[PDB]
Amino acid sequence: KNHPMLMNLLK
Amino acid sequence: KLSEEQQHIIAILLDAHHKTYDPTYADFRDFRPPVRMSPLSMLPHLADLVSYSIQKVIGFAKMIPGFRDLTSDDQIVLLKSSAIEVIMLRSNQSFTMDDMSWDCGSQDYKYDVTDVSKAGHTLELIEPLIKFQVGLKKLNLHEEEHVLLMAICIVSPDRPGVQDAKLVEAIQDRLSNTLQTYIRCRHPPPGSHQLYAKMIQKLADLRSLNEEHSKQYRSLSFQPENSMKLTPLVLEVFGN
Ligand SMILES: CCC(O)(CC)COc1ccc([Si](CC)(CC)c2ccc(OC[C@@H](O)CCC(=O)O)c(C)c2)cc1C
Numbered sequence: 001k002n003h004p005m006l007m008n009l010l011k
Numbered sequence: 012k013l014s015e016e017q018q019h020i021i022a023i024l025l026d027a028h029h030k031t032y033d034p035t036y037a038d039f040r041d042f043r044p045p046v047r048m049s050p051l052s053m054l055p056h057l058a059d060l061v062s063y064s065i066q067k068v069i070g071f072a073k074m075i076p077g078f079r080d081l082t083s084d085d086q087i088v089l090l091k092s093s094a095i096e097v098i099m100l101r102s103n104q105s106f107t108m109d110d111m112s113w114d115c116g117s118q119d120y121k122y123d124v125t126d127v128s129k130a131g132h133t134l135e136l137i138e139p140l141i142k143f144q145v146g147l148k149k150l151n152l153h154e155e156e157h158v159l160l161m162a163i164c165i166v167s168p169d170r171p172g173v174q175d176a177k178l179v180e181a182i183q184d185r186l187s188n189t190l191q192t193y194i195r196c197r198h199p200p201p202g203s204h205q206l207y208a209k210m211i212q213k214l215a216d217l218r219s220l221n222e223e224h225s226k227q228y229r230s231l232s233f234q235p236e237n238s239m240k241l242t243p244l245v246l247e248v249f250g251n
Contacts, residue, residue, distance in 0.1 A: 006069065009069045
């Protein structure tokens with residue numbers, strides 16, 4: 001799926 | 012034998028761990044309170060604890076040499092697959108064999124097998140998890156070996172969903188060779204005996220603990236009343 005929170009924490 | 016770049020790698024990983032592991036556990040005051048009382052009374056507190064730790068694991072992973080050379084997709088799949096395992100590894104720092112508990116600074120934040128049971132988990136996971144903690148503690152790893160093992164755990168090419176498995180392999184091989192050479196040159200016998208092989212065995216133990224945790228997590232998370240008590244990050248990373 002989409003992982004916007006993990007993506008955001010990965011910068 | 013330990014090259015300048017290998018020492019550099021270790022220095023980066025030690026600093027990454029120092030910037031992402033708070034041994035004062037001060038932030039635990041922000042979690043939903045632990046409750047020891049059929050109800051999964053420790054689920055809210057331990058969900059916040061796990062969610063917090065996931066954030067720390069991501070911060071550590073971003074500083075592993077080579078990790079940001081991967082695509083966004085591969086970084087995501089490596090962290091989704093590895094997060095539970097790195098949490099089990101890094102929690103060993105608070106684990107004490109004196110009473111087989113995770114001691115995080117105070118009685119309220121001291122966790123035993125009954126606390127994990129009160130988050131929904133069973134002995135199928137809890138007993139192998141305690142034996143893992145004891146076995147890992149008995150290795151008496153140097154901090155250098157502890158952070159190298161966490162980094163190697165994250166960058167494993169055989170994780171489900173990996174696209175560029177060869178690039179993941181190249182990054183891990185650099186860390187694996189750094190670990191093997193560190194043990195040879197810096198870990199004195201008898202503690203060094205078969206130490207690399209014992210550490211890779213713990214990575215195999217973690218895959219099995221990962222499988223069992225996901226099984227129990229899937230059953231627990233399948234009930235909306237339980238999923239309501241999780242965090243958005245836990246739902247994104249662990250599933251559903
Ligand atoms: C559905 C329920 C669910 O499955 C997911 C919500 C429950 O899951 C659980 C529950 C308990 C544990 Si735990 C042993 C592994 C025994 C209480 C543990 C102990 C200390 C910890 O503290 C970490 C420090 O290291 C913090 C400083 C830092 O990490 O920076 C962490 C994180 C975990 C792990 C997980 C996955």
